[PDB]
Amino acid sequence: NSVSVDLPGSMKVLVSKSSNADGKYDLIATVDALELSGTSDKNNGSGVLEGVKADASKVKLTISDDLGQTTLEVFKSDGSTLVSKKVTSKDKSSTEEKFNEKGEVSEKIITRADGTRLEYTGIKSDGSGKAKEVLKGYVLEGTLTAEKTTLVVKEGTVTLSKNISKSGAVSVELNDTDSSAATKKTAAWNSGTSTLTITVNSKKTKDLVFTSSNTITVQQYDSNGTSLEGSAVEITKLDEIKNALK
Numbered sequence: 463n464s465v466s467v468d469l470p471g472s473m474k475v476l477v478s479k480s481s482n483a484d485g486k487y488d489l490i491a492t493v494d495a496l497e498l499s500g501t502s503d504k505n506n507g508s509g510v511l512e513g514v515k516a517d518a519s520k521v522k523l524t525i526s527d528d529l530g531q532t533t534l535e536v537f538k539s540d541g542s543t544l545v546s547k548k549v550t551s552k553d554k555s556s557t558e559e560k561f562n563e564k565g566e567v568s569e570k571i572i573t574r575a576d577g578t579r580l581e582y583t584g585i586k587s588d589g590s591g592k593a594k595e596v597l598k599g600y601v602l603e604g605t606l607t608a609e610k611t612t613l614v615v616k617e618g619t620v621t622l623s624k625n626i627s628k629s630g631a632v633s634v635e636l637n638d639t640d641s642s643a644a645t646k647k648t649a650a651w652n653s654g655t656s657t658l659t660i661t662v663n664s665k666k667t668k669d670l671v672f673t674s675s676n677t678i679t680v681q682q683y684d685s686n687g688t689s690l691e692g693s694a695v696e697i698t699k700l701d702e703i704k705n706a707l708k
Contacts, residue, residue: 463478464476464477464478469525469532470531471532473491473493473532474491475511476490477505486501487503490511491511491523498521498522498523499511504527506529508526508527508528508529509524510524518539519537520538520541521534521536521537522534522537530551530552532549533550535548543561543563547559556572557572557573558573559571568584568585569582569585570585574676577598578595578597578598579594580594580596581596585606588607589606590605591605591606592604593605593611595624597676597677598677598698599697600700600703602700604624609627609628610625610628611626612625615703615707617708618640618707619640620636620647620707622636622707623635623637631653632656632672634649634651634658635649635651636649636658643663645663646662647661648660656672656674657670657672658670658671661687665683665686667683668706670706679694680695680702680706
């Protein structure tokens with residue numbers, strides 16, 4: 463009878479070959495040992511399935527009509543308040559949330575399609591909390607407010623701040639408390655190329671590029687302070703960001 467359908471979020475659903483007397487299709491899925499079941503208006507594996515955890519928490523799997531997105535939710539045993547929600551979007555990125563007793567989000571883990579992550583923890587009712595970005599090879603740490611995420615790396619008297627706005631726009635700034643003009647770093651941000659250019663003693667020294675691939679690269683200028691030299695090097699560990707700030 464049934465037809466297996468592959469779903470975003472590493473799940474499968476079995477949809478009946480034919481519809482019932484009401485025209486509806488039966489859906490069955492097994493998600494981490496839990497058996498979920500439902501009925502659907504459509505014949506392609508989309509719709510709603512429900513079951514329960516061993517501890518009586520309610521579970522619902524919602525598959526969008528075009529199979530592009532899945533939502534896996536856990537609720538209190540009466541089904542009233544959310545406990546956890548995982549949404550896998552059509553790019554196969556995911557958001558995984560936990561909620562407090564009021565249904566307010568207390569943790570949000572974003573896994574980008576490329577596997578890098580934003581981890582927001584200890585989220586309060588104002589949308590503030592702790593923030594981490596998990597990149598390939600290293601992690602950046604900072605805070606979340608309702609206005610932006612700010613991830614901070616410190617080296618000497620330099621503080622590098624990577625900001626991710628509420629709308630997702632990246633900007634980077636550098637601030638150095640160094641008194642000496644021979645050694646003080648300053649930097650300018652180019653939003654078009656996502657590039658922070660560092661200057662010391664009125665000469666450009668380095669370009670730090672925050673790529674659309676969620677990597678950081680560093681390239682030096684010649685001693686003339688005007689032309690780039692060599693080729694950009696991808697950062698592989700936090701120590702190499704610190705090196706770029708020296």
